[PDB]
DNA sequence: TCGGATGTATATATCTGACACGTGCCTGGAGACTAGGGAGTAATCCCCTTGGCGGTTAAAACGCGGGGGACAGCGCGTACGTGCGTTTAAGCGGTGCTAGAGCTGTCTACGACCAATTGAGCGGCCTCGGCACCGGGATTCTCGA
DNA sequence: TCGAGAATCCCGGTGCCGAGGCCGCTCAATTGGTCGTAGACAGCTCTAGCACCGCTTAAACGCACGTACGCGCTGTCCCCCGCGTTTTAACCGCCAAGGGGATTACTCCCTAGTCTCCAGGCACGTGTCAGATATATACATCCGA
C-alpha cells in the first residue's frame, strides 16, 4: 500500500488553474519535487536544532531553516505562508 | 453439484457450490481451501466481470463449469 | 540547379528542431550493450530494470548537453565558431572535474 | 466524543499535516517533534508547489495545451530567476531545453 | 558473452545531435574522441555507486533507485524515476 | 555668565547656557547658534545687508566674550529694524508653514536638546520588534510629496519612536490632528521631551503647524484596532518587525476606508500580486503596491539607499476578479 | 546629541588596487588588466556578503548579538566552502 | 641606471606569494567592510574577532581560486593579460554568474 | 567545563609514523576539524543506507560501504582493510 | 571483578572506540547501532589521520623543519592525488598555494 | 552409425558419437575434429605431403558419409606410415611435454567434453567469494613464464574452479605434485569429469604431464594451514573474494619460505609500501609485490586486459628495516 | 588572627585563620562563605604561588595581611 | 658569449614563547545483567527480466564535393609595468570599560505514549475527451539572379 | 531586387488510450488523558569586544616613461558542412522461460538500559628547545653589450 502526494498537488492545481489536468508523467515529477525540499528542510532544521543543543524542532527551527535554503522572495513569500498557518492552527 | 476452479497457474479444483451462493461466499471458500484473500480473485465466466452482489445463478452458470481464477495483486 | 544551403543554415535549423524536443538523442540499444559492459567491470551478474537503463541514459544526456553548452562559450571566448577539443578540457576544469 | 477534525483543515492547508509529522518523527531528524512544526512545513511545501504549478500552467497555456508536461515544468522553471536556483542542480526527465542560441552564431 | 567496443554505437550523429541541443553551430572532427571519453569516465562513476548501493541491499538487480540514489551524491540529482 | 537671546514674535525667546554642552566630539554645540541667527536673517530680508559690516566666517568661537559678540548684535542690533511696530507694521502673521530649509533645521535642533544620550536608543532585545532605527528628512519630505494628503485625513506613524517622523508630518501638512504610538520605554521618555521641545522652538519662529499628539501603547492591543481603520494614511517602520506582527497589522489593515494610504519599509504584498482561488483573503487583494524612488541616506542604520513602498487601497481589483468568473 | 549610529560608508575601495594584485599573484596570472579592479570588487561584495547573511540568521537563531567564529564556519559549509582551523 | 624589463619582477612576485601564506589584504581595511555590510541587518552586531579572521581567510581563498581560473581563460584566448570578460567567463561555467 | 578533541589520539599517531617530528598547536586544529568532518561524512552516508534498506541499526556493514562510496580509489581499498582488521581482533577478543 | 580493557586496546586502535560509539548514538543517525560499527569508524579516522600525518611530515623534512606546520598539511594534501580528491572542497587556514606557473608565462 | 578414430601411440582411441553434440549454436562439434587431426599431422612431419591430394576446407559436413570421410583416411590411411614400426623405429618416446600450440587446443577440447552445461557456473550467491570467473590461457602461459618453477616446487590453485589452471601448470612444469581446491559443489563435479576426460586425452597425443589432483574443500580450514605454508608457488584469484577472506589469507601466507610466489587478481600488498611502527605486522612486510604486463582478453568475465599480480617472499625487508632504527 | 582576602573584584573580607591551617583548609573556608570551589583561587603572598601541601607559617605570613584572590576557570 | 649588479641561498649568533612533560583528580567508559524485539532465515509466489525471432525502414555510413573559418603573419598604438618620491593610515602597544556570553537553578507546560474510534485516501473500475497523427491546405524563408 | 523552391505553420478529421471520476474499505490520523522532562526564565559572573591614545614606518598613492602586448587586417588553405545510396541494425511486436524480488512466518541473538566502579584524559604547572631574527658571506639570475 504506497502513498504520495498526488491527491494533494492535484488538489492545489485546481485552485490555482481550475480548468488544467497533469500528466502522469508530470506529477510523478511533483512528487519527487515535495520529497525533494522536504528532506532538504528537515535536514537544516536538525542541524540547528543539534547546533543549539536542543532536542525538539520547532516552527522556529523550520523558520530559519526557509530563510537559509529558499533564494531572495520564495523565502519572503514561504515565511509570511508558513506563519500564517500557525496562527489559524493555534487559534482555531 | 459442483464448478471447476481452474488457476492461471494450472491448479484445478473442485469447489461445491450451490444457486444461491453470491460471488462473495465463492470468494469466501477459495481461501478456506487454498489461501489467497478475497481481493485478489475473479471469475472468467465467457469473459464476464463479475460482481459480489448477485448469485452464481443470476448469470446462467451451469454445473462443472471451468472458471479461469484471474489473480490481480494490491497494486503495480 | 540542385539547390543547397549555405553551410550554417541547416546547422542553425537543427539547434531549433532539437532545442524544441524532449526525446532522447542516444539510439536506446546501443546505450544500452554500454551499460552492460561497464558493469563486466564487477562480477558478474547484474540484471539492471529497464526503469533504470532509462535513468542512466536521462543523466547521461543531461551531463553531456550541459557541457557542451559551457564547451560553447569557451569557444566564443576564443573568437572561434568550431567547438575544439581544447575547449572542452578548459570547461571540465573550471567546473572541477578535470582538475 | 467530538467530531475529528483533521489538522489541515484547521491550519487551512491543502497538504497533510499529519502525514508530514509522521514524516519527521520517522526520519532520525530530532529526539522531538513541536506542535507547530509540521503545520509550518506543510504551509510551505503548499506554497513552493503552487509556485511552480502556476508557471507550469501559464507554459501549459502557451504551447495551447490543457495538460501538464514534464516540458512545460521545466520551462515553468528555468524561465523563473528564483525557482533556477532551487533546481540548479536538478536535472528532469523528458524536460528538454531552454530554446537560446548565441547571438554569435547568427548569420549577419 | 563478452561484451566489448560499444562506445562506438554513441556514434557520431549522435554526438552532433547532442552539440545541437547544446547550441553548437560547428564542431571539429576530433570532438567525437573526446566525448566518447568524458562520457565513459562519467558513466563509470554513477554505475560504480549504483552497483555498490545494490551490494549492499544484496541484490542482483540495478533498481532505477540505486541509479537516483548514486546521482544524488554526485550534486545531480534526478527528478522522476521515484526520488 | 550665560547668553540669552530674543524671539522674533514675542514669546519666552532662549536660554542657552554655559559652556555649550556635548552635542558631538567636536562641535560642542558651537556653529549651531550661528546658523540660527542665519534663519532669522530671512523673510525678513533685512539682516543680510543690515548686518553686512558685522557678521562674518571669523575665529576665535572658544571664548566668551567672543561669544559675547554675536548675540549683542542680536539682542540689542534686532530692535533698529524692530522699532516699526508701530500703527502700519506687525511682523508676521502665524499662518505661515516652514520651508524645507528651516524646517530641517528646526528638527535638527529639537533633535539635539532632547535626545541627550542618543547611544541609550540602541537598548533593545535584538531581531525583535523593538529594535531601532529612523527615516531622514529627506525621504519623509518625498513621502509627504507622493500621498498628497487633503484637508480630511488623518496620520498615525505606528512605531514613531523619539516621534520626528509626526513633527515634518505637522509642520508640512494642513490636516486635523495626527498621532504617534511607541510602546518601548526609552525613546517614548525622549519623546515627552521632543514633544515639548518642538512646540516651544516653533514659536519662536512664530510659524504654524498642525496639531499632534504622541502617545505610549501598543498597536497590537484592541483600542487601536479601532482608530487604524479610521486613519486615511499611516506610515510604519516595519524593517525588522517580523512576520508574525506584520501578519497581525495585515488584519488591522483589512478595515481601512477608500484610499487608505500606508508607507511602509517593507511592503505588506507583493508587487506583482496575482490574483487566484487560493489567495482571495490575502490583503494584496485590496491594495495596490507602488515603490518610491530610492534615494540616498533615506535610513539611518545603513549608508545604502533604502527605498520604500506606498500602499493604496481600492476595493476594485476584487470587482475587476469576479468578472472574469464566468 | 549626535548620533545612534555612525554609518561606516565606502569601504570596499579599502580593498586597494596593490591588493588585488598579489592577490592575482597566487593565482599567478602575470599581467592585469585596468578593468580587473573593479571586477573584482563586485565580486567579494557578492561573495561576502551571501557568507554573512547565513552569519547572521545563525546568530539570531540562537538569539545571541554576536556572531562568532562559528556561525561563519557553517555558514561556509553551507555553500560547500568548508573551512578548516577555526572550526568544527 | 639599471632597470627590469617588464614581466621580470611580475614572475618574481608569483614566486613571492606562493611562497608564502599570510594573508594579503589589509586587516583593518578589511574587517572595517565586515562592519558595514553588517550595517543591512538594523540591529547592533558584535563580530568575536576570530570569526572576522575566518572571513577574510574565506574571502581571500576565494578570490585566489578564482584567479586561477581566470588566468585559464585569458591563456585560451592567446593573451596574456586577465580581462573583466575571463572572470565572467569563469564564473558562468563555474555556476555563480547565474 | 571541560572540552573534547582527538588531540591527544592525533599526537599518538604522529609519534608512529614521524617519532621525531612535533605538531603546532594550529595544525593541531586543523587536524581535529578534519576528523570531525569525516566522522559526520561518513557517519551521515550510513544513516542513509539504513533508511534506503529499511533496517533501523547501523552496523559495520554499514559504514564499510560507507567508506566505499566517500573515499577515492585506493583511500577506499586501504580503510576497508584497515577496518575489517580491527573488527576481526574485537571480536576474538 | 575482571580488571578493565579498552575496547581500543582489544581492536589495536588508538583512536577511542567507546567516544565514536558515543558520538553515533548522540548523533541521531539512526535508532540503534551495532557492536562492531564504532571499531570500523575508528579504524578508518585512524588510517586516514596517519596518511595525512605520514606526508605532511614528509613536507616538514624537506623545508627543514621539525614540526608541522598548516603549510605542510596543504603541500601534503594537494600533492597527493587521493587526498586531493576528498579535501578538494576544503580551504585550510594560513595553508597557502601549491607553488604552480602556466608555462606560456615564463619567458622565452 | 557413429565414428571412430586411431590413438597414434595406442590406447582406448576416441569414441564421437552420432550427429556431434552441441558446444555452441553454430559450430555444434563440427571444426573440431578436422582441427584434431591438424596435431597429429604433425611432429610427425609427414601428413602435410602424405595427405595433401586428399584434405581440403571443402564443403559439404552436414551429412555423415562425408563425415565418413575425412575419418577413413584417418581410420585406414594413418596404417601406411605407422606400418614402419619393426625394429628399428618406435613412434614417439612419452617424455615431450606439448607446446603451446596444441596444449591450448587439447584444453580447449576437455573443457568442451566436460562443462556440459556451462550456464550452470552462474548460480552462485552474488558479491559472495563463489562468484564464478576464470583466466584465459594467454595469462597462465605468461604466469608460468615469470615465476619460472624449478624441480622441487608445489603449486595449489586456491579456489581451482573447474581446474583448467592446474591443468595447464602440470602440463608445462617439470614440478613434484599439484593441487587444485575447491568448495562449489558445481564446478567441482565438473572437475571430476575434467580429471578424467584430460588423463585420456593426453595419454592419446602420448605427451608427457606432471602428477596433479582435483579436491573439494574450504582452504580456510585447520588442514589448509600447513599445506599453504609447504607449497613453493601459490596462484589465487582473489577478485571478488572480499576483505575478509582476504585478511584470512594473509595470515595463512604469513608462514611460507623464502622465495614464496604468490599470483592473484588483487594484490595482497600495496605496489608503495612504505614501513613504519605502525605496519610492521603486516604482511606487506615481508614479500614484494611486482605488477605482471597487462594483456587483452586476459579473463573471462570482462573484455577489457586485467593485470595480475606477483608477490614474492624474501624477509629482509624487516632486515634491512631495523637497521636505520638507531641510525641517527 | 586574621587576614585580609581580597579579591580581584575589589572585595575584601576578614577570613580568621590559624598558622597551623594548611592551603587548603584557606581554600575550604572561603566557599563556605562566599561560594566559589577551590580550583578556582590563589593567594598573592609577594607575587608568590602557593601549593596546597603546607601551612602559611611556613611562609612568613603575618596576621592582617593583604592576600590578593586571583580567579582562575576551568579551560580557555 | 661575457660582465657589472641585484637578488637569493647558505652559514653563524641569540633569544623567546610555545610545545612537550609531569601531576592530580573526576567523570565517562567498562563490566555485568536483564528484557524484548529487530533482523536472520527459510519457504513461497508471481512479476519482470532475458532471450529469440522476423520484418520493416529509419538512421548510420561513406558516396563525394567546396565554401568559410582557422590560423599565421604583420604593423601600429596604447595601456600596463617599473620605479621614484611623497603621503596616508595601518599596525602596534597600552589602558580602560561594560555588556553580553555562558552558567546555574527552579518549575511548568509541552510533547511522547497509549488506547479507542472512524473517515480520509487508496485501489479498482469504467469512460470520454485531449492529443497524436493525418492529408491537404496556405505562409514564410533562404538563395541565386 | 524577385521569383523558385524547400520548410514550416495552419486548418479539419479520425481514433485511441490515458486521465479523471466513482465506490468500497481499511488503517492511519484524531480525540482524550497521563506523565515527566525539556526548555523558559531569572540571576549571576567575568571574559572579551570596543573605544581611544600615540608613534613609527610600511605600504599606498601619484607620476613618468618606454615597451610589449592587444588587436585589427590580410591571405592562404584545409577542413567541415552538405545531400543521395547501398548499408546496417534499431525498433517493434510477439512468444517463452525462469530467476529473483518481494512477502510472510518463526525465533534467536544482539542491543538498549541499568547499576557499579575506576582509570584515562583533561586541566594546570613547568622547563627548554625550535624557529624567528639579524648579520655576513656566497652563488645564481638578469640585462646590457
Ligand atoms: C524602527 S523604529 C521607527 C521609528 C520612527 N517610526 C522613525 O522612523 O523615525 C520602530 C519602533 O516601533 C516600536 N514598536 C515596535 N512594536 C511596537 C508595538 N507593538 N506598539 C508600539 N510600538 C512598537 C519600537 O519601539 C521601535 O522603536
Ligand atoms: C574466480 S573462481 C577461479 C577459478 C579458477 N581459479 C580460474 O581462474 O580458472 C574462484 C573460485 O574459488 C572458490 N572458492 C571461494 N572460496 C573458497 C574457499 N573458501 N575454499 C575453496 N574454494 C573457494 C569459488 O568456488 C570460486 O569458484
Given at each position: 500500500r504506497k502513498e504520495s502526494y498526488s491527491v494533494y498537488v492535484y488538489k492545489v492545481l485546481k485552485q490555482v488553474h481550475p480548468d488544467t489536468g497533469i500528466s502522469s508523467k508530470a506529477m510523478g515529477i511533483m512528487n519527487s519535487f515535495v520529497n525533494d525540499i522536504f528532506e532538504r528542510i528537515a535536514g537544516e532544521a536538525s542541524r540547528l536544532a543539534h547546533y543549539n543543543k536542543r532536542s525538539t524542532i520547532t516552527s522556529r527551527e523550520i523558520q530559519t531553516a526557509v530563510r537559509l535554503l529558499l533564494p531572495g522572495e520564495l523565502a519572503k513569500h514561504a515565511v509570511s505562508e508558513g506563519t500564517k498557518a500557525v496562527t489559524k492552527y493555534t487559534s482555531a | 453439484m459442483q464448478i471447476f476452479v481452474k488457476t492461471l497457474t494450472g491448479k484445478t479444483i473442485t469447489l461445491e457450490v450451490?444457486?444461491?451462493?453470491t460471488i462473495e461466499n465463492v470468494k469466501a471458500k477459495i481461501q478456506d481451501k487454498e489461501?489467497?484473500?478475497?481481493?485478489q480473485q475473479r471469475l472468467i465466466f465467457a469473459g464476464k466481470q463479475l460482481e459480489?452482489?448477485?448469485?452464481?445463478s443470476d448469470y446462467n452458470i451451469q454445473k462443472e463449469s471451468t472458471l479461469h481464477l484471474v489473480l490481480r495483486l494490491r497494486g503495480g | 540547379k540542385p539547390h543547397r544551403y549555405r553551410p550554417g543554415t541547416v546547422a542553425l535549423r537543427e539547434i531549433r528542431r532539437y532545442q524544441k524536443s524532449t526525446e532522447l538523442l542516444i539510439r536506446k540499444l546501443p546505450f544500452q550493450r554500454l551499460v552492460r559492459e561497464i558493469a563486466?567491470?564487477?562480477?558478474?551478474?547484474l540484471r539492471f530494470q529497464s526503469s533504470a537503463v532509462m535513468a542512466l541514459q536521462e543523466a547521461s544526456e543531461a551531463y553531456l548537453v550541459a557541457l557542451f553548452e559551457d564547451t560553447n562559450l569557451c569557444a566564443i571566448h576564443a573568437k572561434r565558431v568550431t567547438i575544439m577539443p581544447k575547449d572542452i578540457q578548459l570547461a571540465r576544469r573550471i567546473r572541477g572535474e578535470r582538475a | 466524543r467530538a467530531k475529528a477534525k483533521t489538522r489541515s483543515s484547521r491550519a487551512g492547508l491543502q497538504f497533510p499535516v499529519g502525514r508530514v509529522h509522521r514524516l519527521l518523527r520517522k526520519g532520525?531528524?530530532?529526539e522531538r517533534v513541536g506542535a507547530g512544526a509540521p503545520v509550518y512545513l506543510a504551509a510551505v511545501l503548499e506554497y513552493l508547489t503552487a509556485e511552480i504549478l502556476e508557471l507550469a500552467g501559464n507554459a501549459a497555456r502557451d504551447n495551447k495545451k490543457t495538460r501538464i508536461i514534464p516540458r512545460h515544468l521545466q520551462l515553468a522553471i528555468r524561465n523563473d530567476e528564483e525557482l533556477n536556483k532551487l533546481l540548479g542542480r536538478v536535472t528532469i526527465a523528458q524536460g528538454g531545453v531552454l530554446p537560446n542560441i548565441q547571438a554569435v552564431l547568427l548569420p549577419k | 558473452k563478452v561484451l566489448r567496443d560499444?562506445?562506438?554505437?554513441?556514434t557520431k550523429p549522435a554526438i552532433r545531435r547532442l552539440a545541437r541541443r547544446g547550441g553548437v553551430k560547428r564542431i571539429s572532427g576530433l570532438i567525437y574522441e573526446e566525448t566518447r571519453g568524458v562520457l565513459k569516465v562519467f558513466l563509470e562513476n554513477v554505475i560504480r555507486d549504483a552497483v555498490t548501493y545494490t551490494e549492499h541491499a544484496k541484490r542482483k538487480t540495478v533498481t532505477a533507485m540505486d541509479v537516483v540514489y548514486a546521482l544524488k551524491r554526485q550534486g545531480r540529482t534526478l527528478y522522476g524515476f521515484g526520488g | 555668565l550665560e547668553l540669552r537671546l530674543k524671539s522674533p514674535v514675542g514669546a519666552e525667546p532662549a536660554v542657552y547656557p554655559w559652556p555649550l554642552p556635548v552635542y558631538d566630539k567636536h562641535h560642542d554645540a558651537a556653529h549651531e547658534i550661528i546658523e540660527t541667527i542665519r534663519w532669522v536673517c530671512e523673510?525678513?530680508?533685512?539682516?543680510?545687508?543690515?548686518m553686512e559690516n558685522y557678521v562674518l566666517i571669523?575665529?576665535?568661537?572658544?571664548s566668551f566674550e567672543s561669544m559675547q559678540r554675536l548675540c549683542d548684535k542680536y539682542n540689542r542690533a534686532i530692535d533698529s529694524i524692530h522699532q516699526?511696530?508701530?500703527?502700519?507694521?506687525?511682523?508676521?502673521?502665524?499662518n505661515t508653514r516652514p520651508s524645507t530649509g528651516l524646517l530641517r533645521h528646526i528638527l535638527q535642533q529639537v533633535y539635539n536638546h532632547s535626545v541627550?544620550?542618543?547611544?541609550?536608543?540602541?537598548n533593545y532585545e535584538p531581531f525583535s520588534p523593538e529594535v531601532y532605527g529612523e527615516t531622514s528628512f529627506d525621504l519623509v519630505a518625498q513621502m509627504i510629496d507622493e500621498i498628497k494628503?487633503?484637508?480630511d485625513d488623518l496620520f498615525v506613524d505606528?512605531?514613531?519612536?523619539?516621534?520626528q517622523v509626526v513633527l515634518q508630518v505637522a509642520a508640512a501638512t494642513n490636516c486635523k490632528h495626527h498621532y504617534g504610538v511607541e510602546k518601548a520605554d526609552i525613546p517614548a521618555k525622549y519623546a515627552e521631551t521632543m514633544d515639548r521641545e518642538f512646540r516651544k522652538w516653533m514659536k519662536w519662529y512664530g510659524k504654524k503647524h498642525a496639531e499632534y499628539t504622541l502617545e505610549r501603547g501598543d498597536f497590537l492591543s484592541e483600542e487601536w484596532r479601532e482608530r487604524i481603520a479610521n486613519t486615511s494614511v499611516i506610515f510604519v517602520?516595519?524593517?525588522?518587525?517580523?512576520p508574525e506582527v506584520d501578519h497581525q497589522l495585515k488584519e488591522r489593515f483589512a478595515n481601512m476606508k477608500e484610499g487608505g494610504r500606508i508607507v511602509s519599509s517593507?511592503?505588506?504584498?507583493?508587487?506583482?500580486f496575482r490574483i487566484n482561488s487560493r489567495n482571495l483573503?490575502?490583503?494584496?487583494?485590496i491594495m495596490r503596491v507602488v515603490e518610491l524612488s530610492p534615494l540616498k541616506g533615506?535610513?539611518?542604520?545603513?549608508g545604502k539607499p533604502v527605498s520604500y513602498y506606498l500602499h493604496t487601497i481600492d476595493r476594485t481589483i476584487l470587482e475587476n476578479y469576479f468578472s472574469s468568473l464566468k
Open positions: - | 450451490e444457486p444461491s451462493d489461501g489467497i484473500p478475497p481481493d459480489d452482489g448477485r448469485t452464481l | 563486466q567491470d564487477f562480477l558478474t551478474d | 532520525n531528524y530530532s | 560499444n562506445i562506438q554505437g554513441i | 523673510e525678513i530680508p533685512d539682516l543680510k545687508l543690515a571669523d575665529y576665535d568661537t572658544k516699526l511696530w508701530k500703527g502700519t507694521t506687525q511682523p508676521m502673521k502665524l541627550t544620550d542618543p547611544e541609550k536608543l540602541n494628503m487633503t484637508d505606528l512605531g514613531s519612536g523619539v516621534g517602520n516595519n524593517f525588522a518587525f517580523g517593507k511592503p505588506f504584498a507583493p508587487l506583482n483573503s490575502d490583503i494584496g487583494t533615506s535610513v539611518s542604520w545603513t
